[PDB]
Amino acid sequence: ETAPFFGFLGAAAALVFSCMGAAYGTAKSGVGVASMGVMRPELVMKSIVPVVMAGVLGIYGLIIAVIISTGINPKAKSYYLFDGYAHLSSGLACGLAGLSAGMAIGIVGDAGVRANAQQPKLFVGMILILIFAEALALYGLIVGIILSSRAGQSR
Amino acid sequence: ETAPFFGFLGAAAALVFSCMGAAYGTAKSGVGVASMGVMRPELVMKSIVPVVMAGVLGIYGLIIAVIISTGINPKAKSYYLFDGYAHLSSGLACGLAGLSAGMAIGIVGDAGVRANAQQPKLFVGMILILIFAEALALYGLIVGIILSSRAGQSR
Amino acid sequence: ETAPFFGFLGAAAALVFSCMGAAYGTAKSGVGVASMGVMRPELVMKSIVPVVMAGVLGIYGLIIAVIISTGINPKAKSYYLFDGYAHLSSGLACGLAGLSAGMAIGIVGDAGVRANAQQPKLFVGMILILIFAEALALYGLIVGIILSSRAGQ
Amino acid sequence: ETAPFFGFLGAAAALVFSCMGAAYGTAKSGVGVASMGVMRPELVMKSIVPVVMAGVLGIYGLIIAVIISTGINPKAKSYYLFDGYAHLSSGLACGLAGLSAGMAIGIVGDAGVRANAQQPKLFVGMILILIFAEALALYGLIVGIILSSRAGQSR
Amino acid sequence: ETAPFFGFLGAAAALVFSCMGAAYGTAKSGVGVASMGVMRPELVMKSIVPVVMAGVLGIYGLIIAVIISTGINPKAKSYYLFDGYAHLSSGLACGLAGLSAGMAIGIVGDAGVRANAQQPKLFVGMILILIFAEALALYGLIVGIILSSRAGQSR
Amino acid sequence: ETAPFFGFLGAAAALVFSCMGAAYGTAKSGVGVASMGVMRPELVMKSIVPVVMAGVLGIYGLIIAVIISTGINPKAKSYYLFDGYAHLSSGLACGLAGLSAGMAIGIVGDAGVRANAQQPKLFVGMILILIFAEALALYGLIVGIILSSRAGQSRA
Amino acid sequence: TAPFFGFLGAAAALVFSCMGAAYGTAKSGVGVASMGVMRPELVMKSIVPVVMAGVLGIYGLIIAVIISTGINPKAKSYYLFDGYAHLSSGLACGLAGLSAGMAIGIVGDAGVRANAQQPKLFVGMILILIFAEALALYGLIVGIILSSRAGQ
Amino acid sequence: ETAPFFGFLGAAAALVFSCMGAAYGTAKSGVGVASMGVMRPELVMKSIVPVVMAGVLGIYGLIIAVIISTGINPKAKSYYLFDGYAHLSSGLACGLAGLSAGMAIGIVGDAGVRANAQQPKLFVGMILILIFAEALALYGLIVGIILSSRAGQ
Amino acid sequence: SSWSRALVKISPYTFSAIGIAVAIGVSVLGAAWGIYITGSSLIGAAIKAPRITSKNLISVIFCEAVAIYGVIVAIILQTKLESVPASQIYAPESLRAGYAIFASGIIVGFANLVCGLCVGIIGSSCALSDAQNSSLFVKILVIEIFGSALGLFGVIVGIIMSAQASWP
Amino acid sequence: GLIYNEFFSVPFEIFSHSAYACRDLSCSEATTVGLIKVRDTYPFGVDPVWHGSRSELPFLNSLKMKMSILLGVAQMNLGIILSYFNATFFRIGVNIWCQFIPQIIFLNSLFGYLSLLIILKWITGSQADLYHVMIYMFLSPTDELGDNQLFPGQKTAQLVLLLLAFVSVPWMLLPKPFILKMQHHQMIHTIEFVLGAVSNTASYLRLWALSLAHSELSSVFYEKVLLLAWGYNNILILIVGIIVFIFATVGVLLVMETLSAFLHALRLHWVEFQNKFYEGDGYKFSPFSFALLD
Amino acid sequence: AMTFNIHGGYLEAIVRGYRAGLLTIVEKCTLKLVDEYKHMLPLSTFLEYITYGHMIDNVVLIVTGRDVQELLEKCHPLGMFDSIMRELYRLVLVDTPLAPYFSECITSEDLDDMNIEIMRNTLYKAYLEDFYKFCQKLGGATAEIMSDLLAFEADRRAVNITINSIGTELTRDDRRKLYSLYPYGHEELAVCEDIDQVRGVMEKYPPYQSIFSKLSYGESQMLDKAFYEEEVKRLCLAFEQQFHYGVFFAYMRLREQEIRNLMWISEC
């Protein structure tokens, strides 16, 4: 039917929004890292952790997209409209959550890197903030996985 | 037939909007903490309260989304448009409440982090304000729970 | 047949708009309260009056949402469009009134925090202004309840 | 048929517009009175007139909306689309007039607070301006009442 | 037919637009008059003439709305689509003319308050602009009445 | 049978846009007059020319609207498709011309009133510029009068 | 009939990818010229970040090529599923490339300034930029996987 | 049926876009010339011709519009949508190219007006830049002629 | 349904012609924008010093290359046109050819615009850099040449898509 | 965790053998009218079958919500009871009997109907109530109806509780100012207490939400590890999956989950338990006991 | 981003070339720089604010009289433009950004602008008004530089007040009421009555930390020289001047600094 035209769209949107959020985080993280390392090159290595923390969202989005893509197989079963709609919903939710988490992580990491050289306690504070932010991305990934799994029944 | 699309979209919207609100709150709190903790190490841990206070809203939104996803069961009951409409309404209400709470909590937490360097007698007031704001998240979760409970009784 | 698709949406919109207005008011109220407490910690506890009164709008919105949810009883009576549309309109009106009251209360509290910080002698005037603002929210809640009461075709 | 939709929409629009106008007027009045609350608290007590006027305008709008709602009795007489359209138009007119009057009164009070703070002799002028502004709300309420009464003339 | 779906809506919109324009003009004039009275309390009483003149818009709008409402009467005679369309057009023209006149009168009065406060010689002379604005409003009302007079022309 | 709705809408739009142009011109004219006040209160009377121009524009718009409304005679000469579209087009053209003329007149009059203090003998040149601008209002009125019946009464 | 969407996917994949590629290359190029005003030697080596940004266009170009080759109407019946899948596959690749290039442009522009100030931090800037550039590669992987679903 | 309407709309767009682009370029060049006149009035006419060079784009647009008008006639053939749409596309392409070239030439002339005054030796460079810009307009005219050639089906 | 049927019933020849014209239009617009961007900096440098006119002309030539490529693509698209027979006005082959033509035109136009903007920005920076120091002109020119490859890649993609035309 | 019958995101052998057994269903599907027949309840923890079943989410959610409601009621009762002890220890005035008694009675009675309904549904097995119809019975403010009521006296008990709650509102506001006037600030307690009671009651659901989130995250991690171990049982793939699972447990399960739980627990303790005690103010007395030297 | 090529590109290139070329002799260099700036005539408002920067001081100097005729000798068009004693002050209140505010703030005329100290107070108030006006035109990276300059001026005024002007009624309240992170956290300098206290106050801003150093130089001067000398030393940051941004103010500041250095050279 027309269900794939929505399911594949949702699967693509998940990865697209996740990549957009990861890029938005990484830009701010890199700007802050450069600003910090201009004056204190020693802490540049310690300031790179939020960049990887933001980049993990890209891997999460890629995993969600792979799951969504593997979840559609007309040769296996008739993908009714319910299955495609649920897959699209899961993709949209995962992508939006990833984008929001990436933006938040980028802002927080840029602020922390700007404040990194001011006090060494920033090395712990920014790490804690980044972990708390990535918790939201993990929760979104879990919700997307649950929705994708529930999409498999379709009566 | 199209009702499960509406229900899945409502659950996805709830999760995504809650994630966005939590991300905005966490980013604001992280910026405030990065600004405050440069001067003193007190803001490193004694003022990390909003960092988890904002993630509480995301946890509540994830719980509501999981409940909504578990609500749909075509193999157990052929859902009419009533179930889809109720699920979509509950998801929209939960997501909007989560976003509003996230924005308010982020603003209040940024203000509190800025004021942290001031007289510490205001910590109790800041915590009280944060709790009063976060009460909106609980109210939204209650409304969503009531809607989900009333959802399945369709004729 | 399509009446619930409007009634549930109206209830959700009422709750969402009430929450949005409450948050909009509470942001300014909390900013002003934090500023005053930094300036004068003595009156910080007594300055949470607009912050506390902000939650009243959210409570009223939750009550209206609960009433709207209790209104939709398909088993009790076949929900014609005349009831679902009325419920949706009542919810929309309550939510818009709550949002307007929240914005007004936020502005009033933002002004009153500085007003009390400069001189606590204006606390009575600030409270009177807040009560006058909340009168709009009370009127909106009453109107929403009255409109929801007309679900009998 | 679908006339109750139009009637309910008109009543809701009337209530919403009246509430928005009253809120804007009250916010402007409070912003104005914030200075008078410190510059001359003795005159601040008499400065609450514009807030009362805004509340009165909101009350008039709510009363008009309540009358419009009470005019809808489907079980007593069938509501033709003519009556619903007339009621919706009456509500829209009352709401727009109330919002405009509230905004004008709010601006007038915001100016008059400083005007009276500079010189107490401007209280008479402020009162005259407020009365002239409230005349518009009174005219709008009268027009809405006339339209609501005429709404039942269909057959 | 569905005549009041447009005729009554236009009748309401006429009063709505007239009230909005009068409110804007009165707000501008009141701000100017408050500033002038703060500058000099002597001119406050004498400078209310533009404020009063701006009130003619409300009277004209109320009269037009009453005439339009009286012009709709299915019991007396059925009104076709043309009978309602003409009334709606007349109401829209009257409302737009009232809004334009109100805005112009508000700007003119805001300028004239300062003009009179500076040079009392030009105070009385400046009333020509207000007279011209009132004449424009009267011409618009006359055009609207002429348009509305064609209510019974249908057949 | 739906053409009269379009015709009445066109007449109303003509009146509304003419009034809007007149108001836009008069606002700038009054602002300039107030600015020229106190500095040269003697020239207050001589500065009323833009007010007269705005009043003339409003009168022309009202006359065009009344002329259009005079064609609302459904008791004879069935409107057909032309009597609505032609009237609407004529009204729209007249209103837009009035709005443009009002904006130009307001700009020129405000500039002249502001410049009336420097080289006061340039009032004649300012009035000449204002008249050259306001000629567009007369041109638009003529065009509207031409379109008032050219495509309206020739439906047969 | 449906194949219009499938054809549009390939065009969109290249267009949206190049849109972000130009934006990344522009920001990276501007910083390089600023550094080249004073630091003569540092600018020559700093061109790598611009070269890295230009690679994203190549990745989008290859993805577009695959989509075009798979839209053969006379070879196999291009049902609506194939058109929907190809359009979806292109949309992800184009959107991801646009975001990935945008981050590289923002990061690269700051990196040129940072290198001109302290040459030591050049390694750190490259590492962050390389990690950011992996998102475009991540988008490429998703594009291949989605396009591979054109079996039926 | 609607192909004549599509062709007429395309011709109108071809005229209007080129006219707007030429007008913008000429206005920018005239502002630049007026600014440069007060400094070295002896060079006011030394660059007035490239300032008014927007007449070239105007004439090209007029020629394109005339060509598009000529090709539409019911008597010659009952042209279908394949002809009207093609004519509209050719006209739109020519008009867009003309507008872009006019804007670019206006900016280049605004720069060159000051550049030549600051350095008389830069007149040849400004002329070369203007010729390079007008190459785009020439290419657009060629493309428009080529497209309109096939429209006579 | 009825609205969907009307949307599916639109003439593909109109869409194909629109895309063909839009490709050339967007290419011309992007080339002109890039030319203006480069020319502002070139004129500024010449005002500073007329020594680097030959070096500056390379940016203008590169910008005009985008317009040349767009013109070539437009000529190819015009060659791709057919007679549009009445019988096959809604045939699947005609619809596929029209969709492919529109997609190729849109891709070519967007790629040309992006490449023109990038080349204009690069040349504007490079002229100022050369004015600052003529030693850096080689690296700037190399970077501009590398960035110009976006237009070539877009043209290649459009040419590849052009083979899909099969209008009877 | 031992109570929850979940060990490292995996069930295990309960003190009993199997709480619920598939009613017949030697070959029939689990989703059936017979479903699963329980021989006896597992005392050590939850039924092992329930954890891995499709119906895990609804039953576990209902149980967690009921447990959270009961725990919040108990904590609020303890906090309110501490008020009388604090008043007696400090020998406070008649304000305790004047205000502490109505304050501890109104909220207790208001939550008592819900707590008793939850207990009765758990005790009497009134399946006609479940998680939803309990709220439905609590929803109606008006009298009459009561068709779904399970308590034999619920028809009169609800009205009595409503009357008591209505009468308790002034009893918590008047007597303290009355005593103050007789012996010759209540605005701070006024209005705040009424909304704060509802806020504290609602906040208890945070514990249930956190528990559900932790369970979901642990289940996701365990599912990923099992999928790696089953299909990717190859040595390199198995080692990589084990390393990934260890890293995930260290990150989310160990650090993030514990931090969030601690923060939520502290917020709950301050918000409700401390609300009825402590009262703030004061300072920490400290002598010059070589504190800097220490 | 495309707006730079849309307009202002040629002027930006000319300014960049003039700045790159830069490096009674001091008077001649100042006249040449002023002529170059004038010949350059969106960016118009920026140029007006940049000129008004020194025009505030020029108008303050012209406000005297008292040998007022000598002001024509220093009629440098860069700062001493003719377009930019209460009766004459009202006339001079036009064509300047800070003049309308100073009309009310300095309505006492010579009473609030006494040549000993209160004239410096009026000049500081005018400088604060001009800095606020410049910061109002936000949208570029120059906001940070403007904030740094205003902070340096305010901190230098506060240090001068705490050093010796405290006896001249420049108390802690006057450190911001009359003496023009500083726009939000200037209260820390109200109690910095000692050089060690000044260093401690500077410790609140780690970028400002170690800038005072021993405070033997720079902070030793009164008026606005204490923290302004820190900005002069750190002006190497302004020497970056990243492209496609407003650099006219940076070029003007660099030319002024070069003129000051040439004047300080004098007879070696």
Coordinates of C-alpha atoms in Angstrom, one line a residue, chain A residues 1 4-5 8-9 11-13 15-16 19-24 26-27 30-31 33-35 37-38 41 44 51 58 62 65 69 72 74-75, chain G residues 80-81 84-85 87-89 91-92 95-96 99-100 102-103 106-107 110-111 114 117-118 120-121 124 128 131-132 135 138 142 145-146 149 152:
Chain A
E1 CA 0.0 0.0 0.0
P4 CA 6.1 2.6 3.0
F5 CA 5.8 6.2 1.7
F8 CA 10.6 5.3 4.9
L9 CA 10.0 9.0 5.3
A11 CA 13.1 6.5 9.0
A12 CA 15.0 9.1 6.9
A13 CA 13.7 12.0 9.1
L15 CA 18.6 10.2 10.8
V16 CA 18.3 13.7 9.3
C19 CA 22.5 14.5 12.2
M20 CA 21.3 18.1 12.3
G21 CA 21.3 18.0 16.1
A22 CA 24.8 16.5 16.2
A23 CA 26.1 19.1 13.8
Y24 CA 24.5 21.9 15.9
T26 CA 29.5 20.0 17.4
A27 CA 29.8 23.5 15.9
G30 CA 34.4 23.3 18.5
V31 CA 34.0 27.0 18.8
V33 CA 37.2 24.4 22.3
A34 CA 39.1 26.8 20.0
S35 CA 38.3 29.8 22.3
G37 CA 42.7 26.5 23.6
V38 CA 43.7 29.8 22.2
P41 CA 46.6 24.7 25.0
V44 CA 42.5 21.4 24.9
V51 CA 32.5 16.9 21.2
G58 CA 24.9 10.6 15.6
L62 CA 22.2 5.8 12.9
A65 CA 17.6 4.5 11.4
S69 CA 15.0 0.2 7.9
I72 CA 10.2 -2.9 6.9
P74 CA 7.2 -6.4 2.2
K75 CA 8.6 -9.8 1.2
Chain G
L80 CA 5.7 3.1 -5.6
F81 CA 7.8 1.4 -3.0
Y84 CA 9.3 6.2 -2.0
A85 CA 12.5 4.4 -0.9
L87 CA 13.2 9.6 -2.3
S88 CA 13.6 8.8 1.4
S89 CA 17.2 7.6 0.9
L91 CA 16.4 13.0 1.7
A92 CA 18.5 11.7 4.6
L95 CA 19.9 16.7 4.9
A96 CA 22.8 15.1 6.8
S99 CA 24.2 19.8 8.5
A100 CA 27.6 18.0 8.5
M102 CA 27.6 23.5 8.3
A103 CA 29.4 22.2 11.4
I106 CA 31.7 26.8 11.7
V107 CA 34.5 24.6 13.2
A110 CA 37.5 29.1 14.2
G111 CA 40.2 26.6 13.6
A114 CA 43.1 29.3 16.5
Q117 CA 47.3 32.2 17.3
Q118 CA 48.8 29.1 18.9
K120 CA 50.3 23.9 19.1
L121 CA 46.5 23.5 19.1
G124 CA 43.3 19.4 18.5
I128 CA 37.5 17.8 16.5
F131 CA 35.1 13.7 14.4
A132 CA 32.5 16.2 13.1
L135 CA 28.5 12.6 10.5
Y138 CA 27.3 8.3 8.9
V142 CA 22.3 5.4 6.0
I145 CA 21.2 1.0 3.6
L146 CA 18.0 2.8 2.6
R149 CA 15.8 -1.7 0.2
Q152 CA 10.5 -5.1 -3.8

